[PDB]
Amino acid sequence: GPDETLSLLADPYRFISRQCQRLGANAFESRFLLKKTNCLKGAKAAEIFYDTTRFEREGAMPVAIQKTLLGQGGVQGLDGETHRHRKQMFMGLMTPERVRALAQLFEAEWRRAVPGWTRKGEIVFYDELHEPLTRAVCAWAGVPLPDDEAGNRAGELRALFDAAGSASPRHLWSRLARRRVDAWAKRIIEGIRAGSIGSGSGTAAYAIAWHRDRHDDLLSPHVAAVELVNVLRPTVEIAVYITFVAHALQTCSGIRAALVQQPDYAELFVQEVRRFYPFFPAVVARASQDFEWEGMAFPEGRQVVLDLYGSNHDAATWADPQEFRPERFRAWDEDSFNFIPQGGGDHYLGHRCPGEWIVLAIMKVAAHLLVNAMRYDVPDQDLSIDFARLPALPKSGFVMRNVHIGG
Numbered sequence: 282g283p284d285e286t287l288s289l290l291a292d293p294y295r296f297i298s299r300q301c302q303r304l305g306a307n308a309f310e311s312r313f314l315l316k317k318t319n320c321l322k323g324a325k326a327a328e329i330f331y332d333t334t335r336f337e338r339e340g341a342m343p344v345a346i347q348k349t350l351l352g353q354g355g356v357q358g359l360d361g362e363t364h365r366h367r368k369q370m371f372m373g374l375m376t377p378e379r380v381r382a383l384a385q386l387f388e389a390e391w392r393r394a395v396p397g398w399t400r401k402g403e404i405v406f407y408d409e410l411h412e413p414l415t416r417a418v419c420a421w422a423g424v425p426l427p428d429d430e431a432g433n434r435a436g437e438l439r440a441l442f443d444a445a446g447s448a449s450p451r452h453l454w455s456r457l458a459r460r461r462v463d464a465w466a467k468r469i470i471e472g473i474r475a476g477s478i479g480s481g482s483g484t485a486a487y488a489i490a491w492h493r494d495r496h497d498d499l500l501s502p503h504v505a506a507v508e509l510v511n512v513l514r515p516t517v518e519i520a521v522y523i524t525f526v527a528h529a530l531q532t533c534s535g536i537r538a539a540l541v542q543q544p545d546y547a548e549l550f551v552q553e554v555r556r557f558y559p560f561f562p563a564v565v566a567r568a569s570q571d572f573e574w575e576g577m578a579f580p581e582g583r584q585v586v587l588d589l590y591g592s593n594h595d596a597a598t599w600a601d602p603q604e605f606r607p608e609r610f611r612a613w614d615e616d617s618f619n620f621i622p623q624g625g626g627d628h629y630l631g632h633r634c635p636g637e638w639i640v641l642a643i644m645k646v647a648a649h650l651l652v653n654a655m656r657y658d659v660p661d662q663d664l665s666i667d668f669a670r671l672p673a674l675p676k677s678g679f680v681m682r683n684v685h686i687g688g
């Protein structure tokens with residue numbers, strides 16, 4: 282039929298679920314760029330999407346994303362045993378103690394940045410999160426980061442996802458940010474291999490610099506650089522989820538008090554933040570063989586997009602997805618396909634986000650400080666979510682006035 286690209290960019294989070302609702306189905310055939318695209322939504326859809334005998338990621342990623350968001354040669358573009366062996370490198374980083382260490386470093390950096398925020402009077406909370414995250418994740422990952430460069434590197438990491446997918450000249454800064462960050466990370470890898478950088482044996486940058494592939498070869502310095510940015514960048518992106526934590530504390534009644542007094546509530550709350558709020562709209566794969574599913578044809582080579590936001594707001598799964606209610610997670614069966622803000626399926630055997638433990642730990646630190654430590658006022662502003670923005674944010678970016686902290 283018609284090309285629907287422009288309609289998708291106008292409503293990137295909701296386009297799929299809205300059409301699904303219109304059609305009374307969990308899937309529909311469409312066309313993005315010029316490719317026929319099957320669009321899927323829901324737990325059953327997610328589960329077939331993560332079947333690696335039917336779906337491949339190889340070459341499925343639009344080049345614009347490679348040259349900004351993702352880089353070229355990274356784990357996202359791999360399939361099969363090549364993929365599994367590369368994904369294992371990421372998974373080995375995420376021990377409960379290593380995740381804890383990153384959370385601890387991030388709390389310290391948050392606390393160090395508050396005085397700065399106090400003397401400012403008024404801050405855009407979102408704008409202020411990138412640098413502490415950058416400082417935290419760099420130290421955790423063994424990436425040296427001098428004090429006077431921290432601001433700039435945070436700006437560059439931010440530019441990879443917050444200027445990327447944009448209708449404006451911001452796409453140009455994003456592409457240059459990618460070349461700068463790639464060259465920086467590459468210099469890090471090279472110094473580790475040459476002995477000039479003493480990154481500890483438990484650190485991401487070390488693991489990535491010394492990773493051997495299935496042929497016992499080091500990654501090429503550029504591919505290693507891209508994989509290191511795949512740790513640094515998405516950690517800084519947690520700024521979005523932290524902003525949504527502040528937003529929930531502000532727009533939904535009872536949340537604050539429940540968090541203060543109920544110990545087990547934090548975990549339910551951060552889960553519901555990830556379910557409720559838009560972040561990553563969709564993931565893309567290519568059908569690897571001819572098959573049919575619930576009446577829909579999936580010929581070899583068909584581009585297929587899995588709607589994450591729609592799946593997270595699926596009525597069959599949640600009954601009242603439209604409500605923000607952390608308690609729903611008391612009844613969650615931990616299914617790997619019905620709740621997928623960072624992908625579904627298995628972490629080792631598919632492309633599901635290895636960053637979930639980090640996101641959760643950091644979201645918890647955020648929720649803890651925002652209720653138990655950090656005091657602030659919230660002036661009249663537009664807190665409505667910008668569903669036409671990538672990534673989606675409250676329009677204001679969540680503005681704070683009179684910020685101060687204890688311990």
Ligand code: HEM
Nearest residue numbers: 356357511512515516518519560561623624632633634636
């Ligand atoms: C900030 C919130 C985050 C969101 C919303 C998010 C979401 C996602 C999604 C939707 C995917 C694709 C899953 C798929 O292709 O099936 C993914 C993959 C990935 N994520 Fe995240 N993530 C986040 C944080 C992180 C963090 C902190 C890390 C740190 C290591 C990380 C590292 C990665 C990597 C390396 C991949 C590719 C994995 C693969 O292809 O096997 N992410 N993420």
